[PDB]
Amino acid sequence: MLGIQSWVFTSDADEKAAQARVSQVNSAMNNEYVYNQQRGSLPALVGDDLKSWLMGKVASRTVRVKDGTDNGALLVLPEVGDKQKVFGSTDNGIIESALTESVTNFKKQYPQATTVQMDYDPLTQELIFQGVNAENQLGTTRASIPAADFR
Amino acid sequence: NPSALVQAMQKPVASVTDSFKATLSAKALRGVEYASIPTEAGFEPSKALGDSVSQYTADELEFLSDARSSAELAQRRSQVQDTRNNYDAMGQNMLTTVAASMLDVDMVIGGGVGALSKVSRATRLAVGLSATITPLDVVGTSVGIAMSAIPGIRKVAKAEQVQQGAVRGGVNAAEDAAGTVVPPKDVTVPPVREVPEVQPIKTVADEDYPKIDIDTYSNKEHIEVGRSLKTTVQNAVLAVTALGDDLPEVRALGRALGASRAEIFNTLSDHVRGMSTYEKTILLHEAAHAKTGRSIRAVESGAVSDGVVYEAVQRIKEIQWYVKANVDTHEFISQLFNSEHFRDALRSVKMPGSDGTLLSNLMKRVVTLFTGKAPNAFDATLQAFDPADVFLNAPKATPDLQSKVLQAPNVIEMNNKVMGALNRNFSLYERLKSFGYKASTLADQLVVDATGTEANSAAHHARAAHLASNVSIVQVDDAFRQALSADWPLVQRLRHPVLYREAQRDLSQKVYQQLAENHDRFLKGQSIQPSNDPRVNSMVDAFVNSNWAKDELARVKGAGINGADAVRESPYYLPRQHSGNKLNDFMRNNRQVTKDDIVGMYTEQFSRMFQQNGITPETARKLGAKMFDNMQDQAAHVQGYRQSIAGMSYDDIENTLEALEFDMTAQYTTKSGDMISPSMFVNNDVMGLMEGYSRRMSGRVGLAKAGFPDLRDAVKAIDEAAAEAQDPAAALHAFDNTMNQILGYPTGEDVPDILRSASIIGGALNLANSGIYQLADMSLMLQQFGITKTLKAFGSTAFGRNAMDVAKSAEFGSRLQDVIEARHVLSGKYRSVLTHLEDNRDIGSLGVAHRYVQQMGQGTRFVNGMEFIRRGQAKLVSGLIADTVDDAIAGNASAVTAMERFGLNQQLLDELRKATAANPDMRKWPDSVRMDIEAVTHNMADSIVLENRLGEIPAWMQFSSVGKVILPYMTFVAGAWNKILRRTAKLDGATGVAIALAYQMPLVTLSSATSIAISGKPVTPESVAQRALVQVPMMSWAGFAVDFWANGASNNLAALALVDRMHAAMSSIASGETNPESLIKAVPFLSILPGMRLMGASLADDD
Amino acid sequence: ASIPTEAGFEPSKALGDSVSQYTADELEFLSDARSSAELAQRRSQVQDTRNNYDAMGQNMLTTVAASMLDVDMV
Amino acid sequence: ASNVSIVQVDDAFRQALSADWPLVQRLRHPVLYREAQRDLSQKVYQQLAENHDRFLKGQSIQPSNDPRVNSMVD
Amino acid sequence: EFDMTAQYTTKSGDMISPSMFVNNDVMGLMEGYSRRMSGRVGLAKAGFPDLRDAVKAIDEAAAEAQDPAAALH
């Protein structure tokens, strides 16, 4: 699910990417748990059952963009009312191919960025990309793309 | 038996609403969108939900229990679901939910599903995350983000490039196919070239968007580098050591410190690379001030009794004490660094209780502080103690603001300039005080909103009183709407606009007549009986239960406002007035009746009324003639105070005798044999008779509580104050205009009601450190964006050229400004046209209503919004007619030969020219020619509405140069509307806040551009944007959003309730508390920004 | 004093069947509970109050002097 | 007569800090513990100023968003 | 009567206002009021609704003893 290729002989570069992606998944799970708790909709589970519930919730929204470098890139799509209005399709295999140009351009503009985060702004019908740092802190790089051309 | 004693001695359980405070809690602001749904007999929202009540969060139930019929419940259950879906997406990031409290229009104005719950959750989240280092900074930053994302614009594309890009998809996305059908053994190239069906569109980053960032370091100690990027001290230090191979082996000291604020550089890994070796050592030398963070913790009970540090602080304080007798901690510690000979002073002394110089042992403890490792690195700091652009800065009073017009050198000027851009009243209070001293004392009693004393101005009390009335006017308004909900579905209203208006006039007459009987019967101890029309009973019942009739009579008697005890009370009370409109309209159709008959008519009544006082016949005729002269003035809106000081302003006989009982059924006979009676000229409508009474009585009650229960001394106190300034004429005029506005009279200008804006004055210092200035600065930059886009849009279209150009010409700009501002139409000669158009046509007459009824959601948000456009367009049409009539009278032949198309002739024109020359003032036309030119204009007004529907220029109007700018206007606006609905397609609140601005913004731009040119200065986009602020400050822009959301009586509740929620928070802030709740409540003007983004960016998209 | 109040607590509904083992003044002292912990502590104190006076009941006169010498009572 | 009603407000102040400050914590950080009372006193004093001036002018009262202040005022 | 918000400016440029010196605690403000009002109410019911004659009745009583200074004290 992390999208790493080498499975027999691995260099330190793969180790760094795995380490970053584990923290990314942890941050996503923390945000999901906080959002669920605030609405008062958490299930009656504890420990491993809750961990599995959260992991299953997060697992459905993961997409492994392909191009840009080796190991590609990893993104977690935001939650939307209905996918057919924003993304234009309910299948992830098409969005994965469609996001390639935007991801490649974003990485070309900001080489120093290691990870990418995606968010949706309903008020102006806009998709936003931003670089992220460890400890759930955010960077200064940002980009904007309308939904119409993506569809 | 025994269990009876236990419960007999317990205390009663608390109510089930005493708990849940700050979550449940004003229904009018929550049922606007469902107003016109008829009530269902015997419906009960609890009995209809049944088992389903177990799937809601204790506030959704609160919002659902208001249903009065099944359809209303069905619609509420639908809205509650969209409210969940919207907030699910925003939950992906915790910070964004904090900014949702200030940027969701539905939540800050009204209509949303719960407002208190969201705010009380945002405050808790902001407090939690801080455990951007204090709760205020979390609130401040949450909005800095979520608004800095540069938007993308559409652009035309070449078809070939897009198809090439799309083809590289599918490929690179079909390599994951299994290919078990048509294997590679059975593949062949097709004999024709395919091509996909993509559209030719690009996206391009915008260029004019500002780079918005929020300053959150001014009120804290911080380090400046090279006086941008913002980081922390414990982050910067590590980077220095890593990329510090050119440093003396100091590097170990840096490593030790790195394992032990805010920093700003004017890419981090390269900033430190562009620094010399010397500077980056001073960077560590100043970072050695880490003691301050630790001195504070040992003064506060944070480091309770932890050894090492607790002892080091004590034995530094002891040395601090010693130096005084023999030769706060922060200044001593700072002096240890920022000086040379101070260190030399301590070398010449040894300690009284241990070996070593006094200086030596002082350093021993600093290392324990900024390292924390108990008691060898003294050599490093000793050698680091031996000009660069790195400094340690103490907190400063004036934040850094990016906008041009807000920068000031000290704190008083900055505060004065900030409040000016938010509220209209401030610049008025400021201008009143320049008239000497007597004015200053009187200003505080009229317009100010004091924050630190009980004695408060008259406007404040009037505002407070005017909310009570509207809470009960609304309940009757919603009954009128429901009476016609049937028999007139939305589709029918759009076809028969003219006839639809009479369905209201009939009910108004019926109800008004019914309320006359029940009053006179109640006053004489008889019995009331119902009517046989089912609508009238419901309308009357909604009126008695509304209960405003007794409330007003009770309130007006409070403070004993002049001769108010003479009135009589009953639940069915309703005032009485004559109407100047019904008189003119009746005298127009019939021309056998002349002024000679109305005066004789009133003479008969007056002669009989005062018989017992020996009224001589001459006075009878004088009074009869002065009941007609001051009745025409009522229709033209030229009245004002100083003519109703004897008593109250609602008696038709007092207002006639003061200027130096009627049968209402006695029949008079005219010259031609037609019979006439005074009953035909009485006012009939209800709502237009309730609002007028309430507005003026609120103004009188507010003025009394300030210290003027009677206006007779109020006039004198003004006449005396004006005779102190160097120019008494201006001061008297200003005070008269202010008093007319307070009492609710037509001043002739187009401005919002005075009660809608506040004049907060108080503590400057406390406000500055709250952080409001940073949030006010941000909302003020986005104006540049919208106005720049509007100017570019005018520059692009062909119609925009010559329209932005007539506004510069001195030959025509002045007249266009007057046409936009409606200065010739609101009062005076020509108001007949506006009255005829205003209340004799419906939204169906716009034409644009038909063209969009199905894209826009066909609901209330459509009809509620279209009234705003009606009332916008009527003024423009009337102003155009008024301009083109005066132009004709001036002498322009081309206009005269177009005027005559509707009935002019030499006889009328000669008399008009003669009359205008004798007196150019002409507050009204003479009685000799009134009824002809009045009819000529009305014929014109109708024709333009029919030909102009499409947004076209009629053939006979080609002569008018200014008309070329007004008539085609509505086609220009329709272009912007199409592009927005091609982007959202919903028409929710955020879309309404964009459409309203799309319609209303350009007019302000043209008016401001015209205003700048005549003053002989260049017209640049920044200049236009700055001049627009002195016409419509930020808090008045939000007025338009409220105007497009609600109509009529429901508008006042929302518009007023925002201002008091601002005053009540700034008052608490000025006192000394800065709870983040206060900061959230204190900036209601910040809601329109996301709506501004949609309109501003949408004007750059290609078609 | 310093025990937080419990929302919707009712001392009569929490005792249930147990109300049949008290002397009509112990019930008076027990009906003041505002939360479960307070009731649990009151039920504990009522027991020490019985144990103390059991010993003093061995001699009738000593119970007469108990009215003037028990600090908690005076 | 006065003290019969001063006490009911005293017991509310104690209960507002019963949580967030168990007896063991009070014994470690004596100096800082004093500010937790000064903060609530300021908040409540400020809140009671608004509701008085609004009551005297015939307006309406509204609650606050901090759960302790509502209980203290009640 | 005091504005309580109007801002004054000192010699050094620091701004100052009278709001900073108001009392804030509640309990220490309730007990002080109650204790003195109880004392005034009790004194009124004894026959001295106003202290002006209460002072006089003491000044007159002291001038009878052999040592007026001690009695007044």
- Does residue B548 contact residue B519 with C-beta atoms inside 8 Å? no
Q: Does B4 touch chain C (CB under 8 A)?
A: no
Task: Please answer yes or no on whether B7 and C12 come within 8 Å at the CB atom.
Answer: yes
- Does residue B199 contact residue B156 with C-beta atoms inside 8 Å? no
- Does residue B260 contact residue B372 with C-beta atoms inside 8 Å? yes
| C-beta atoms surrounding B167 within 10 Å | 14
Task: Please answer yes or no on whether E25 and D41 come within 8 Å at the CB atom.
Answer: yes
Q: CB-based burial of residue B873 (10 Å sphere; 0-12 exposed, 13-18 middle, 19+ buried)?
A: buried
> With contacts defined as CB-CB under 8 Å, which chain B residues touch C27?
2, 5-6, 9
Type and span of the H or E element at B950: none
Task: State the helix-helix crossing angle for B772-796 and B411-420, rounded to 10 degrees.
Answer: 50
Task: Please answer yes or no on whether B1072 and E20 come within 8 Å at the CB atom.
Answer: yes
Cα–Cα nearest to B1047, from B865, B846, B869, B872: B865
> With contacts defined as CB-CB under 8 Å, which chain D residues touch E19?
none
Cα–Cα distances in angstroms (integers) from residue B125 to residues A123, A135, B94, B130, B135, in the given order: 23, 18, 8, 9, 9
- Does residue A128 contact residue A144 with C-beta atoms inside 8 Å? yes
Tokens of B193: 């070239």
Residues B173 and B170: their CA atoms lie apart, in Å, by 4
Beta bridge partners of residue B350, listed in sequence order: B357
Residues B716 and B693: their CA atoms lie apart, in Å, by 26
Determine what percent of chain D falls in helix, strand and coil, rounding each to the nearest 5.
Answer: 70, 0, 30
Which position has the token pair 């950080």? D29
| Among E residues 23-52, those touching chain D with beta carbons less than 8 Å apart | 24-27, 30-31, 34, 37-38
Cα–Cα nearest to B475, from B26, B28, B1052, B45: B28
Which spans in chain A are helix H?
A: 12-39, 48-59, 83-86, 92-98, 100-109, 147-150
Q: Name the residue among E24, E31, E34 with its Cβ closest to that of D45.
A: E24
DSSP of B663-674: -SSPPEE-TTS-
Cα–Cα nearest to B1025, from B784, B817, B805, B782: B784
Interface test mutation site (partner B, options A33, A124, A150, max chain B beta carbons within 10 A) = A124
Question: Which chains are adjacent to chain C, needing at least 3 Cβ pairs under 8 Å?
Answer: B, D
Q: Does C2 touch chain D (CB under 8 A)?
A: yes
Q: Does C7 touch chain D (CB under 8 A)?
A: no
DSSP of B394-419: ---SS----SSTT--SSHHHHHHHHH
Q: Does B19 touch chain C (CB under 8 A)?
A: yes
Cα–Cα distances in angstroms (integers) from residue B842 to residues B837, B839, B847, B963, in the given order: 10, 8, 11, 24
Q: Does B176 touch chain A (CB under 8 A)?
A: yes
> With contacts defined as CB-CB under 8 Å, which chain D residues touch E30?
6, 9
Residues B999 and B452: their CA atoms lie apart, in Å, by 41
For this PDB entry, the determination method is cryo-EM
Q: Do chains A and C touch (3 or more CB pairs under 8 A)?
A: no
DSSP of B435-493: G-SHHHHHHTTTT-EESS-S---HHHHHHHHHHHHHHHHHHHHHHHHHHTTTT--HHHH
Which residues contact residue B149 at a Cβ distance below 8 angstroms, ignoring those fewer than 6 apart? A121, A126, A128, A142, A143, A144
Residues B312 and B308: their CA atoms lie apart, in Å, by 6
> With contacts defined as CB-CB under 8 Å, which chain E residues touch B452?
2-6, 19
Task: Please answer yes or no on whether B1077 and D64 come within 8 Å at the CB atom.
Answer: yes
Tokens of B526: 């008889």
| C-beta atoms surrounding E32 within 10 Å | 11
> With contacts defined as CB-CB under 8 Å, which chain B residues touch D31?
300-301, 304
Type and span of the H or E element at B153: strand B152-156
Strands, DSSP E only, in B210-335? 222-225, 229-231, 262-265
> With contacts defined as CB-CB under 8 Å, which chain B residues touch A143?
149-150, 205
Residues B1050 and B110: their CA atoms lie apart, in Å, by 11
Residues D1 and C54: their CA atoms lie apart, in Å, by 38
What's B37's DSSP letter?
A: S
Task: Please answer yes or no on whether B411 and E15 come within 8 Å at the CB atom.
Answer: yes
Reduce the secondary structure of B570-629 to three states and give it as a string. Answer: CCCCCCCCECHHHHHHHHHHCCCCCHHHHHHHHHHHHHHHCHHHCCCHHHHHHHHHHHHH
Min distance D51 CA to chain E CA atoms (Å)? 16
Q: Do chains A and E touch (3 or more CB pairs under 8 A)?
A: no
> With contacts defined as CB-CB under 8 Å, which chain E residues touch D73?
none
Residues B781 and B211: their CA atoms lie apart, in Å, by 10
Reduce the secondary structure of B1018-1072 to three states and give it as a string. Answer: CCCHHHHHHHHCCCCCHHHHHHHHHHHHCCCHHHHHHHHHHHHHHHHHHHHHHHC
What's B185's DSSP letter?
A: G
> With contacts defined as CB-CB under 8 Å, which chain E residues touch D3?
34
Q: Does C3 touch chain D (CB under 8 A)?
A: yes
Cα–Cα nearest to B810, from B1010, B1020, B1017: B1010
> With contacts defined as CB-CB under 8 Å, which chain D residues touch E26?
9, 13, 41, 44-45
Resolution (A): 3.3
Task: Please answer yes or no on whether D53 and B119 come within 8 Å at the CB atom.
Answer: no
- Does residue B1094 contact residue B148 with C-beta atoms inside 8 Å? no
Cα–Cα nearest to B776, from B1096, B1085, B400, B1027: B1085
> With contacts defined as CB-CB under 8 Å, which chain C residues touch B5?
24, 27-28
Task: Please answer yes or no on whether A145 and B267 come within 8 Å at the CB atom.
Answer: no
Min distance D14 CA to chain C CA atoms (Å)? 6
Q: Name the residue among C7, C8, C31 with its Cβ closest to that of B6.
A: C31
Residues B204 and A128: their CA atoms lie apart, in Å, by 14
Residues A68 and B424: their CA atoms lie apart, in Å, by 55
Task: Please answer yes or no on whether B13 and C11 come within 8 Å at the CB atom.
Answer: no
Phi–psi pair at B669, nearest 5 degrees: -120, 125
Q: Put the strands of the sheet holding A116-121 in their side by side order.
A: A116-121, A126-132, A138-146
Q: Does E17 touch chain D (CB under 8 A)?
A: no
Min distance D18 CA to chain B CA atoms (Å)? 19
Task: Please answer yes or no on whether E5 and B1072 come within 8 Å at the CB atom.
Answer: no
Q: Do chains A and B touch (3 or more CB pairs under 8 A)?
A: yes
Task: State the helix-helix crossing angle for B728-743 and B458-483, rounded to 10 degrees.
Answer: 40
Question: Which chains are adjacent to chain A, needing at least 3 Cβ pairs under 8 Å?
Answer: B
Task: Please answer yes or no on whether C10 and B9 come within 8 Å at the CB atom.
Answer: no
> With contacts defined as CB-CB under 8 Å, which chain E residues touch D53?
none
Residues B984 and B990: their CA atoms lie apart, in Å, by 10
Min distance D11 CA to chain E CA atoms (Å)? 11
| C-beta atoms surrounding A81 within 10 Å | 15
Which position has the token pair 């700055």? B1026
Cα–Cα nearest to B552, from B426, B697, B436: B697
| C-beta atoms surrounding A5 within 10 Å | 9
| C-beta atoms surrounding B890 within 10 Å | 11
Cα–Cα distances in angstroms (integers) from residue B897 to residues A86, B961, B1081, E1, in the given order: 59, 16, 60, 70
Q: Does B1 touch chain C (CB under 8 A)?
A: no
Which residues contact residue B980 at a Cβ distance below 8 angstroms, ignoring those fewer than 6 apart? B991, B994, B995, B998, B1094, B1095, B1098
- The helix/strand/coil state of A87 is coil
Q: CB-based burial of residue B422 (10 Å sphere; 0-12 exposed, 13-18 middle, 19+ buried)?
A: buried
Min distance C30 CA to chain B CA atoms (Å)? 9
Task: Please answer yes or no on whether B203 and A122 come within 8 Å at the CB atom.
Answer: no
Amino acid found at B120: S
DSSP of B491-550: HHHTT-HHHHTHHHHHHHHHHHHHHHHHHHHHTTT------SSHHHHHHHHHHHTT-HHH
> With contacts defined as CB-CB under 8 Å, which chain A residues touch B983?
124-125, 146, 148
- The helix/strand/coil state of B264 is strand
Q: Name the residue among E1, E2, E5 with its Cβ closest to that of B763.
A: E5
Tokens of C13: 């509904």
Q: Does B1102 touch chain D (CB under 8 A)?
A: no
Q: Does E69 touch chain D (CB under 8 A)?
A: no
Residues B496 and B503: their CA atoms lie apart, in Å, by 11
Task: Please answer yes or no on whether C10 and B5 come within 8 Å at the CB atom.
Answer: no
| C-beta atoms surrounding B431 within 10 Å | 12
Task: Please answer yes or no on whether C4 and D14 come within 8 Å at the CB atom.
Answer: no
Cα–Cα nearest to B147, from B781, B1077, B1078: B781
Task: Please answer yes or no on whether B201 and A148 come within 8 Å at the CB atom.
Answer: yes
| C-beta atoms surrounding E46 within 10 Å | 8
Q: Does A60 touch chain B (CB under 8 A)?
A: no
Cα–Cα nearest to B772, from B1085, B352, B355: B1085
Task: Please answer yes or no on whether D14 and C1 come within 8 Å at the CB atom.
Answer: yes
Which position has the token pair 């906008």? B403
